Amino acid sequence: PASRYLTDMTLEEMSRDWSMLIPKQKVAGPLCIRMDQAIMDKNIILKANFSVIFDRLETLILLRAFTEEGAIVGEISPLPSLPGHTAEDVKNAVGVLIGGLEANDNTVRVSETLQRFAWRS
């Protein structure tokens, strides 16, 4: 107490508005997954912001999928009910998005922060 945040996004990236040409949305536990169904054939990078506590990545604040050119085409966010999630919830929601984008022929990569979070639980 209190918490800090490690993030892959500039302050602009996590504040910017975005919308989906073809809006797809799915609830996975306490988290909302959105991805633009229209996006295809792109190289995508998943970037997250995590609360950091006791030097441990603690909880997902925001995840977004960016194309190589910086466009937001996917989002993972907790429900405003503020239902608290677990690291498995997160890893689960994340694979759902990955699968969603690879359906459309997008090559998906994850950030170093997520690469590390995968194995930290």
Author numbering: 85 to 205
Task: Share the article's original sentences.
Previous studies using recombinant Alb/76 and Ud/72 EDs have shown that a single W187A amino-acid substitution is sufficient to prevent dimerization. However, as the strand-strand dimer has never been observed in structures from these strains, it may be that the PR8 ED behaves differently. We therefore introduced the W187A mutation into the PR8 NS1 ED bacterial expression construct. Furthermore, the rationally-designed ‘helix-open’ NS1 protein (W187A) was poor at binding synthetic dsRNA, perhaps indicating that ED helix-helix dimeric interactions allosterically increase affinity of the RBD for dsRNA, or that ED homotypic interactions facilitate oligomerization of NS1 and thus cooperative binding to dsRNA.
During infection the influenza A virus NS1 protein participates in multiple protein-RNA and protein-protein interactions to perform a plethora of functions. Present models of the tertiary and quaternary structures of NS1 indicate that the protein possesses two globular domains, each capable of forming independent homodimeric interactions.
